[PDB]
Design a protein around this ligand. Sequence first.
Ligand SMILES: [Ca+2]
Length: 279
Amino acid sequence: AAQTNAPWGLARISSTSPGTSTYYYDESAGQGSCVYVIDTGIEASHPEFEGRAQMVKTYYYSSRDGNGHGTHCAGTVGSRTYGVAKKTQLFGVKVLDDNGSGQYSTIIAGMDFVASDKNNRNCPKGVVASLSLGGGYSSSVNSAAARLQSSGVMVAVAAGNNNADARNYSPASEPSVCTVGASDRYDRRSSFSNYGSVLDIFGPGTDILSTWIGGSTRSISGTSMATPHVAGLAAYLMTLGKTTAASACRYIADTANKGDLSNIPFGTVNLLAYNNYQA
Ligand SMILES: [Ca+2]
């Protein structure tokens, strides 16, 4: 399948070179997989989700996304126009308030919720969790991310926006999950993206168009935006049978475009997520 005039980041993950605008992908499009977006919520009524998104948990007075960040990330995972895995099932877990903030205890509870809740959902091809959030190092936060991965969920986490070594942020610094840095449309490391040996992969993160609240769209930047590209890619690859939740991060790294990014500090992987699709 081919989607013309796609957002640059979708084109980039389906390509060996920058500068094109068509997203190429297998029509299965992540059907039968599930992705949990652990964030500010998801505006499930947005036409772009086509009834495939549901809020399943909140730790606040409402499950509504009053911010937009979570709706944007979910759109990159699985919206019809802006999403990597256009037929996946999206589940929203609101651990961040409408200002985008959250206590670590609430974030931890949200991760352990997903480890259990996946047993309440139909996800024959596998389960992914996308965590476009973080803060300073916390062993408890890292442990929660490791538990979620161990339970059989592919965990993708943002590296952080501190232009610093991600080893000092959580859950970015947990070795067993998939830590995602950000790149721009010219294959530069995004200027804010954290780096370091704990990164596993880069994805598109500068000027990413996706869904927003009020049935709208907008383009924003962050490692928060790169993470759902990798989460959606994992769901897509799991539906195709190419990998599993336990192995997807390594599979993505093994099949990535190698050595094509610029301003990669020494010691950080030079790997850009790639779906390896040949129509
Ligand atoms: Ca890993």
